[PDB]
ORF1a polyprotein
Amino acid sequence: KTHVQLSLPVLQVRDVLVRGFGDSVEEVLSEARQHLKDGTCGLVEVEKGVLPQLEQPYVFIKRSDAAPHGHVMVELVAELEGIQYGRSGETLGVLVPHVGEIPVAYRKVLLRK
């Protein structure tokens, strides 16, 4: 399918144990997509002070359309040194590996895969 319905665990930034997906834009997009498929991907909501506590390159989920069955349609965009790879809408959060942290909420998304 071109899209897949997922419910992402929302994590507090200070709880996150693995603070990024890798060391290049291509690698983080690849690993984010794999973790999304495997159910091992968390979401951190972006506020002041959040991104400096995580590791670049960042992977964002951004809104791609203006929400079937409550799932916001999203796509992935990476960022490294102020340059973004991908073009999309508002940021819903930054993705990180999930390795068992306890979430504060869930964000329902329809991921363009």
About this structure: The two ends are 8 Å apart (CA to CA). The chain has one helix and seven strands.
